[PDB]
């Protein structure tokens, strides 16, 4: 916290008294997320309820980020653990999850791709920083939408910087010993991309742990209909390959989806 207070540029340093908390817009064990106001901006605030090290990491990551497909950091409060809070821009159009599954708004192909492309661009950005960042929690809740249908990647509370005998191991043990890479994000993305196209929650009929289990152990993936365009189904098939190294880099995901926009 002393190391952080020193390294984080001072313009980001916020006092809790500078923040006005309106509503709660999201929740969790970690803490709650309020809509509010700060330095004459409409903002979203994550407030916290090893906890120190989690918060110091998250700020260290957020303050690196500048890209129009990634949530815009505004500042944090670093006084003491009790005060701890994180502030970002607010985006009115709400989560992608809501759009698809609650409001059940029916989007056309162009609109869907724009979103897919924007998210891929944000991930590309993160993965190709000098010191790559893994989001590690990409989902339709953490894809937020501008009124005009563009999208940004949010919530870096699980994010980590990428760091710099097996013949008889059970697969799940072998997988524990292998440190995960930026490729984990691509797998999450793939599901998001299917979620967008179908309108459907992955394994909608299953509780989260069961769905994970099926993907992980029984190697199941959501159904790929014949009507899904080829270049996309390809990306899906590759993107959620159990073998991480077989998943495409986001730079290619972008390239392909932008092609589709040219042909849309």
Ligand X SMILES: CNS(=O)(=O)c1ccc(N2CCOCC2)c(Nc2ncnc3[nH]cc(Br)c23)c1
Question: Given the rule CB under 6 A, which residues bind ligand X?
Answer: 25-26, 33, 44-46, 71, 86, 88, 90-91, 94-95, 141-142, 144, 154-155
Between the alpha carbon of residue 184 and those of residues 43, 91, 160, 244, the distances in Å are 29, 26, 12, 7
Task: Check if the beta carbon of residue 74 is closer than 8 Å to that of residue 41.
Answer: yes
Task: Check if the beta carbon of residue 25 is closer than 8 Å to that of residue 35.
Answer: yes
Nearest approach, Cβ of 141 to ligand X (angstroms)? 4
Contact partner, 165, from a second copy, ligand X, none, Cβ < 5-8 Å per class: a second copy
The two beta strands, 73-77 and 13-14, are: parallel
Nearer to ligand X, 88 or 188 (CB): 88
Output b/e per residue, 134-166; b: 16+ Cβ within 10 A: bbebbbbebbbbeeeebbbbbbbbebeeeeeee
Task: Check if the beta carbon of residue 254 is closer than 8 Å to that of residue 187.
Answer: no
* Residue set of the binding site for ATP: 25-33, 46
Contact partner, 192, from a second copy, ligand X, none, Cβ < 5-8 Å per class: a second copy
Nearest approach, Cβ of 11 to a second copy (angstroms)? 32
Nearer to ligand X, 155 or 195 (CB): 155
* Residue set of the binding site: 25-33, 46
Contact partner, 219, from ligand X, a second copy, none, Cβ < 5-8 Å per class: a second copy
Question: How does DSSP classify residue 81?
Answer: T
Contact partner, 226, from a second copy, ligand X, none, Cβ < 5-8 Å per class: none
Nearer to ligand X, 101 or 238 (CB): 101
Question: How does DSSP classify residue 103?
Answer: S
Binding site for a second copy (CB under 8 A): 136-139, 141, 158, 165-176, 178, 180, 183-188, 191-192, 202-203, 208-209, 211-213, 215-219, 241-244, 246
- Residue that is written with structure tokens 């890209």 in the block: 67
Nearest approach, Cβ of 136 to ligand X (angstroms)? 13
Q: Is 137 a catalytic residue?
A: yes
Question: How does DSSP classify residue 131?
Answer: S
């Amino acid at each position: 916290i002393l190391l952080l207070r020193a390294g984080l540029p001072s313009h980001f340093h916020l006092q809790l008294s500078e923040i006005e908390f309106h509503e709660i817009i999201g929740s969790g064990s970690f803490g709650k997320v309020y809509k509010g106001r700060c330095r004459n901006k409409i903002v979203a605030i994550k407030r916290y309820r090893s906890d120190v090290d989690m918060f110091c990491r998250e700020v260290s990551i957020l303050c690196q980020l500048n890209h129009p497909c990634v949530i815009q950091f505004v500042g944090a409060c670093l006084n003491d653990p009790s005060q701890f809070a994180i502030v970002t821009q607010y985006i009115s159009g709400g989560s992608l999850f809501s759009l698809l599954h609650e409001q059940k708004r029916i989007l056309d192909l162009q609109s869907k791709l724009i979103i897919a492309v924007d998210v891929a661009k944000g991930m590309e950005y993160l993965h190709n920083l000098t010191q790559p960042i893994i989001h590690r929690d990409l989902n339709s809740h953490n894809i937020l939408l501008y009124e005009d249908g563009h999208a940004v990647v949010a919530d870096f509370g699980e994010s980590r910087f990428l760091q710099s005998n097996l013949r008889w191991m059970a697969p799940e043990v072998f997988t524990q010993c292998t440190r995960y890479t930026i490729k984990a994000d691509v797998f999450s993305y793939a599901l998001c991309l299917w979620e967008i196209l179908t309108g459907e929650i992955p394994f909608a009929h299953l509780k989260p742990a069961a769905a994970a289990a099926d993907m992980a152990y029984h190697h199941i993936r959501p159904p790929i209909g014949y009507s899904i365009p080829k270049p996309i189904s390809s990306l899906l098939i590759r993107g959620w390959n159990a073998c991480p190294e077989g998943r495409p880099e986001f730079s290619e995901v972008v390239m392909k989806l932008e092609e589709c926009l040219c042909n849309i």
